[PDB]
């Protein structure tokens, strides 16, 4: 099944260009219009433009002046570029697969069914910095009944975003990962909390697995009592 | 060309919510809705109208006529709760998004936080930092606000607290976070973290 991946996500610099790429996996790029939407609060949801899969190209008439689309369908993947950004072009950015319907010989319509899963795209002056990861370790005894609540602090990073797994994705149930402060430094910080049989401490190792993607850092703690 | 939706639609359970969006000769043009729940991608709902894709429940109905379409959820429930956005895009008309309805579901009972409190790791103060982490999560009337103490005094300078952040469960998460010294952490008896929620307050407190 077709499955659509925006590049990485991060910072561009006040000015610069905005360059992020969308891989197409599961499926044939032909037939279809390969969109570029965005997201920010209060901004909703906002059309950026397509590219139909031999090159043409359709673009929102307000950033027109700004923007390219284009396709590369040998490595089945399309592109945008938004040059001179500033702080209103902070937003999460989705590729999404249009698709068109004949009704009759003078009429069709459009929808995007396949999205891809969003990036991050912070406009900032400030440097990329990649987080101290520590461990938040269970108290010596629980006060929850029973259960034990451990986790994982992710110190001091920037941009967002920053993703937490618990043992490589084989525990799930239990894991809260909270959205970041932004302290007065400038920087964020998380946690993510799990919570645990106490039995289990003895027989579990836990390991968050901490993923900065715009510092290209990955850090996997181990939470010991 | 411009799409008007009304900002909210608030509903009870097994009622139904309608939202619309408003467009001049919008019934000639082939109206698609989307979904977007807090940090999630949007999903289409309908399509062309009226059209369900595949594993869409037919709760979701849509209608589309002169000025307005409607996106109609019968019998909702709390896994409803989203941001719903109308959007026209065929032969005639590129695409345009209207402005998004938020639907909240009413009376889902009001849940007390439950709050984590953990100390400074020590291999933070090895560091030459420490940090106290007050999690905050479950609560649901929707709001908190969060007071910290060293011993018995109020501490303030240092605490930065997050903004409510929806659930899964539509119940909310928050954190509060207690940035401080090494010397002050082992120089005071106790900390503590008070999170208050409609009026009643539960506080956790922690030692070095």
């Known amino acids: 099944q077709v499955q659509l991946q925006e590049s990485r996500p991060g910072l561009v610099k006040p000015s610069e260009t905005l360059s992020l790429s969308c891989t197409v996996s599961?499926?044939?790029?032909?037939?279809?219009?390969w969109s570029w939407i965005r997201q920010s609060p209060g901004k909703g949801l906002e059309w950026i433009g397509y590219?139909?899969?031999?090159?043409?190209?359709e673009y929102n008439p307000s950033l027109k002046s700004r923007v390219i689309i284009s396709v590369d369908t040998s490595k089945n993947q399309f592109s945008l570029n938004l040059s001179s950004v500033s702080a209103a072009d902070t937003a999460v950015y989705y590729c999404?697969?249009?698709?068109?319907?004949?009704?009759?010989?003078?009429?069709?319509?459009?929808?995007?069914?396949?999205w891809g899963k969003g990036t991050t795209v912070t406009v900032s002056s400030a440097s990329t910095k990649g987080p101290s990861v520590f461990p938040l370790a269970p108290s010596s005894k629980s006060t929850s009944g029973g259960t034990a609540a451990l986790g994982c602090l992710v110190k001091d990073y920037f941009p967002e975003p920053v993703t937490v797994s618990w043992n490589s994705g084989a525990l799930t149930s239990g894991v809260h990962t909270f959205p970041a402060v932004l302290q007065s430094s400038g920087l964020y910080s998380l946690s993510s909390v799990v919570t645990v049989p106490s039995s289990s401490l003895g027989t579990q190792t836990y390991i968050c697995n901490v993923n900065h993607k715009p510092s290209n850092t990955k850090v996997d703690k181990r939470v010991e009592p | 060309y411009e799409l008007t939706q009304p900002p909210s639609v608030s509903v009870a359970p097994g009622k139904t919510a309608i939202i619309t969006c408003g467009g001049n000769?919008?019934?000639?043009?082939?109206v698609q809705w989307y979904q977007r729940k807090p940090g999630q991608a949007p999903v289409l709902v309908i399509y062309?109208?009226?059209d369900r894709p595949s594993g869409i429940p037919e709760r979701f109905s849509g209608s589309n006529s002169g000025n307005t379409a409607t996106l109609t959820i019968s019998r909702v429930e709390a896994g409803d709760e989203a941001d719903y956005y109308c959007?026209?895009?065929?032969?005639?008309?590129?695409?345009?998004f209207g402005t998004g309805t938020e639907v909240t579901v009413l009376g889902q009972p009001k849940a007390n936080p439950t709050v984590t409190l953990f100390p400074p790791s020590s291999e933070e103060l090895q560091a030459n930092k420490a940090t106290l982490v007050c999690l905050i999560s479950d609560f649901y009337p929707g709001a908190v606000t969060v007071a910290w103490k060293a011993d018995s005094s109020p501490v303030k300078a240092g605490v930065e607290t997050t903004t409510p952040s929806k659930q899964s469960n539509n119940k909310y998460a928050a954190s509060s976070y207690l940035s401080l010294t090494p010397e002050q952490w082992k120089s005071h008896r106790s900390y503590s973290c008070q999170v208050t929620h409609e009026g009643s307050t539960v506080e956790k407190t922690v030692a070095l």
């Open positions: 999404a697969r249009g698709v068109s319907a004949l009704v009759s010989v003078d009429y069709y319509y459009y929808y995007m069914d396949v």
């Open positions: 599961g499926g044939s790029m032909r037939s279809y219009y």
């Open positions: 590219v139909y899969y031999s090159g043409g190209t």
């Open positions: 000769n919008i019934g000639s043009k082939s």
């Open positions: 062309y109208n009226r």
């Open positions: 959007q026209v895009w065929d032969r005639n008309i590129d695409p345009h």
